[PDB]
Amino acid sequence: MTADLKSLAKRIYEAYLKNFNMNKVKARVILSGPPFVIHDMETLCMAEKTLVANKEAEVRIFHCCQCTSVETVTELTEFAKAIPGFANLDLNDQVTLLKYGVYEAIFAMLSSVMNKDGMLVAYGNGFITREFLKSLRKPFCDIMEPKFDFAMKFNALELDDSDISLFVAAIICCGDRPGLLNVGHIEKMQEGIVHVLRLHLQSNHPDDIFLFPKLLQKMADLRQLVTEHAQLVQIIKKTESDAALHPLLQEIYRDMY
């Protein structure tokens, strides 16, 4: 890798460590063994009563997840400035790339805090079990299990934060998002990031030279995961009278898929 490329990879990496609340190194430290375990209705309510000393438990959970989304949206917007060319793009194209990319990035990064038994929540202070989420009443029990299925395979790739930062940058740089005005410049931006991702993976993972095509397929998987998630969110929005959607997230979903 040329010093410029090698340096650009570090640039991306440092912006990822700087802007994102959680990262894989820290998550693994906490998960290695002290997070309060949410494994049933009793422990969920105990955990809630920590913050609010009426709505169904499923709906409370539905709204906590949204707060994590809003926060990650803000962090991703700042992260994106480190991508060579992004800040030089038309303002509307920036909005378009982030609108379509944020949820793909969200589910990619949530894998870092997930293992086969559950996931870290509430800024590392809670661990909610996979089985508890499966026990929620339909259709809320169908929200997270596809995310766990994705994460277990994604985590099997054994990426580190230096790979993931580039992967997330690559996600944001997809030149085939609908409504992009300056498609040609975005494709050049994408080609540059994917170029850095490709070379970095070869350097960082000599034991798996097929990691790059595996990750391209995970990008396609994430796109389908997001489409299906948005559909389930919409169904919960229309049915379920107590389920509200944060206005920033509504605008993300609006006219998306």
Ligand X SMILES: CCO[C@@H](Cc1ccc(OCCn2c(C)ccc2-c2ccc(SC)cc2)cc1)C(=O)O
Question: Does the footprint of ligand X cover residue 128 (CB under 6 A)?
Answer: yes
Question: Does the footprint of ligand X cover residue 76 (CB under 6 A)?
Answer: no
Question: Does the footprint of ligand X cover residue 61 (CB under 6 A)?
Answer: yes
**What whole-number distance in Å separates Cα of residue 152 and Cα of residue 160?**
15
Question: Does the footprint of ligand X cover residue 17 (CB under 6 A)?
Answer: no
**Are the CB atoms for 208 and 121 separated by under 8 Å?**
no
Question: Does the footprint of ligand X cover residue 121 (CB under 6 A)?
Answer: yes
Instruction: For residue 36, give the 3-state DSSP assignment.
Output: strand
Which pair of structure tokens corresponds to residue 54? 């009426």
**What whole-number distance in Å separates Cα of residue 25 and Cα of residue 11?**
18
Question: Does the footprint of ligand X cover residue 45 (CB under 6 A)?
Answer: no
Nearest residue by C-beta to ligand X? 69
Which pair of structure tokens corresponds to residue 241? 């009278």
Which range of residues in 77-85, 88-96, 115-123, 206-214 is near ligand X by CB under 6 A? 115-123
- When binding is defined by CB under 6 A, the residue of 30, 122, 141, 219 that contacts ligand X is 122
Which pair of structure tokens corresponds to residue 26? 């820290």
- When binding is defined by CB under 6 A, the residue of 82, 136, 143, 174 that contacts ligand X is 143
69 is in an annotated binding site: yes
Who's near 62: CB < 8 A, 6+ residues apart?
A: 140, 143, 236, 243
Question: Does the footprint of ligand X cover residue 43 (CB under 6 A)?
Answer: no
